[model samples]
Target: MSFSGKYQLQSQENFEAFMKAIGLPEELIQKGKDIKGVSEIVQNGKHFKFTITAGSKVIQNEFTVGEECELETMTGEKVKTVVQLEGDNKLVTTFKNIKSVTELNGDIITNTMTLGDIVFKRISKRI
Candidate 1:
């Protein structure tokens, strides 16, 4: 259950729809849809650093479980977020108006993102 490796985007469901629901511009949405992002996570005890590289954008954030930290969104907006470990091995957080739950199962990392009534799932594989 240690999420301390590199992961690559495998498949996404309703990605564009969720982005549109979050009010991202069409161009950004298209770029997101076309890119297969890679995420690198480093975890030590309760500390974690998550980095994602997508096309020309690189989003990185460092935080600890149950601690509030600043997180930047894909649309270039910064918001306060607190990440918590839920269920078996899920990282759950609510940022801006979106609730995101990321879990690692075997070699696959699944991210379930919910924005209001729109929900999208992204699956990533360990690399």
Candidate 2:
């Protein structure tokens, strides 16, 4: 059977628990538990909205599939990315337009920078 389920951030308490289990630093834990560093996400159809609060400011944005979005990291680095709906999953990834590839780090790296390598299966299906 195919694995199917809804993904939710659950609660702030759960988030704290997860961070603790991951062995995150004390500062990160405190920041995560703080209301100012928390975010609320709601997904419906092919669109989703994320409400993020940090410091004395609260920001919210609604994202839809097939739309280009600029991501600004916590360090204030801006990166261009895009979102697409594949099957029942929504994927938000960086824009990578390439036509060449090279093998580095003992692995085949492709020009596509969406993240992860393109692996070819030995057999489509085994009998």
Candidate 3:
């Protein structure tokens, strides 16, 4: 089964700390730290579209598995990369010094990113 649902952010662990590592603007982080963001995902086989909305920002990223495409970063920038589907449940992508891995099980989705030695986790629940 693939992830195809509307989800809402439930928790973000090490969020501020990880953003600090990325040197993200403190103002932006402050605005989103307690924000409840929503994400709508559409997955069709190898093609996937992930759109996330936070405040007034709607970040959309479309990609094909194993093919080169642009994926959005937390800083609102796109990075040309390839995403891989592992074991039909995990979506893995890497850019710069960070590794992003999203795992879906049932209606709960867990997104974990590793930057340097810090491991950041964001959990989502279908809504």
Please give, for residues 19-96, the per-residue lDDT of candidate 2 as tens digits.
Answer: 344345657657646442334546666566755443233555556657776654323345576665445422335423
Residue 121 in candidate 1, Cα distance off native in Å: 0.8
Task: Please say which candidate is ahead in lDDT: 2 or 3.
Answer: 3
Question: Which candidate would rank higher by lDDT, 1 or 2?
Answer: 1
Q: In candidate 3, how many Å is residue 36 off?
A: 1.7
Model 1 CA lDDT for position 73? 82
Decoy 3 TM-score against native? 0.92
Lowest summed lDDT window (length 10), candidate 3: 52-61
Global lDDT scores for all candidate models: 0.84, 0.38, 0.86
Q: How are the candidates ranked when ordered by lDDT, highest leading? A: 3, 1, 2
Candidate 3: C-alpha RMSD after superposition:
1.5
What's the TM-score of every candidate structure?
0.90, 0.36, 0.92
lDDT of 3 at 113: 93
lDDT, residue 84, model 2: 56
Error of 3 at 57 (Å): 3.8
RMSD of each: 1.6, 13.7, 1.5
